[PDB]
Write a protein that binds this ligand. Structure first.
Ligand SMILES: *Nc1nc(C)c(O)c(C=O)c1COP(=O)(O)O
Ligand SMILES: *Nc1nc(C)c(O)c(C=O)c1COP(=O)(O)O
Ligand code: NI
Ligand code: NI
Lengths: 233, 233
């Protein structure tokens, strides 16, 4: 009401980024978001990046430890040691995902004015439930995986009607929705199906591309391409 | 005495490294050092690697924020935000160096038999006091600097009486020692002379490089020349 300076938070969030201190950066944007004000494209970018870094570092640590755990199964204490370290990391992963999901469902998504940013948050929602999914105990895994799917799906509809096939975010949605299908629902089928499509529909309008993102669209289109054959191969 | 196994901590430390969680890694190696045993060659590497990464990130952020704390000034408001963020980072930085300095002065240096490690720890000592010197205030800055120089100085002796001009640790000692004179005591004079002399003495016996550390010896020499080069203008 007078206790928060939403503008200084953004500067500080921007300062934490330069300093490569993303936990701090994420802490500032979470706080900017809770002020209830619909985010500007720069702020949305600052939020996405911060949390991308914060959650991403853990997802990468998890994988490394998730491996060492297996490839060191023979022994007990050792493997057993790696298992606890992994659980320590999953607790961190969850706290991060519950927070982004909470901001996403209570502040961002409901106040998305434009369709472009609505799809973007819906996509984030899909990504973060997916992160919870990758580390959920079989019992809760079903419900979670479903949260992800329906979030991506809802973003996929909105995009398939308000956004051009070449728009970076729509393409980005297809990129991760397709990954969700290959890595989560372990369905190389539905996967490839979506990644190839979204790619053609982009090509069909390669001229609809703009210098405003011709470098971004194709960039993601290369990732869609790379993954695509990476699976067929 | 039965509450913590040194070997399991080391494995904990290596696991953390693989997952690139250096703070966890440093905490493990700190525990290993406190176990009271002179460190092995592997354990020493794990310690310096971990702390180099932990303090490195802070020094790095300290600079990014300090430099931005300047490009401001005119904005007393933003300047305060920057300044406080700098102090926060300083407190972290200062805590890390304090711990390392404590480990070195209490457990490591005192129980360093082989003249190699002793020089390595004595050097680490000069380095960490140097890090403190960079963020110290005029008041106590002198004494701190006085601590950096003394630690390097004695390390410089033992080396130039036990290590060849080509041994990596001796070369490294000369590099940071020369970086201290230039960056800290502000005098490229004694800085270049020390760097250039550590280099000339290297090549003099150039064909003394062992396949085991020629690349290592080489990397230190390039830096010595590059730094020296930059000090030549
Ligand atoms: N989702 C997404 N959107 C945009 C605009 C991109 O350029 C890219 C890739 O560069 C992606 C895929 O993003 P990640 O969530 O995997 O970082
Ligand atoms: N001091 C030092 N020693 C050794 C054995 C090295 O290989 C290197 C460089 O890789 C150095 C310089 O180390 P920093 O204190 O700048 O990380
Ligand atoms: Ni207020
Ligand atoms: Ni014990």
């Amino acid at each position: 009401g007078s206790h928060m300076d939403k503008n200084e938070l953004v500067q500080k969030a921007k300062l934490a980024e330069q300093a490569e201190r993303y936990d701090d950066m994420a802490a500032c944007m979470k706080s900017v978001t809770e002020q209830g004000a619909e985010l500007s494209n720069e702020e949305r970018n600052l939020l996405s990046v911060a949390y991308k870094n914060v959650v991403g570092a853990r997802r990468s640590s998890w994988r490394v430890v998730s491996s060492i755990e297996q490839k060191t199964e023979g022994a007990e204490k050792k493997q057993q040691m790696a298992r606890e370290y992994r659980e320590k990391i999953e607790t961190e992963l969850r706290d991060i995902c519950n927070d982004v999901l909470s901001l996403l469902e209570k502040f961002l998504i409901p106040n998305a004015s434009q369709a472009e940013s609505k799809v973007f948050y819906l996509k984030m929602k899909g990504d973060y439930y997916r992160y919870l999914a990758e580390v959920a105990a079989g019992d809760d895994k079903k419900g979670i995986v479903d949260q992800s799917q329906q979030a991506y799906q809802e973003a996929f509809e909105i995009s398939k009607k308000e956004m051009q096939p070449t728009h970076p975010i729509r393409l980005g949605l297809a990129l991760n929705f397709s990954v969700f299908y290959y890595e989560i629902l372990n369905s190389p089928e539905k996967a490839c199906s979506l990644a190839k499509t979204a790619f053609d529909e982009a090509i069909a309008e390669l001229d609809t591309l703009s210098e405003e993102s011709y470098k971004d669209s194709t960039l993601i289109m290369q990732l869609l391409r790379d993954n695509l054959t990476l699976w067929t191969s």
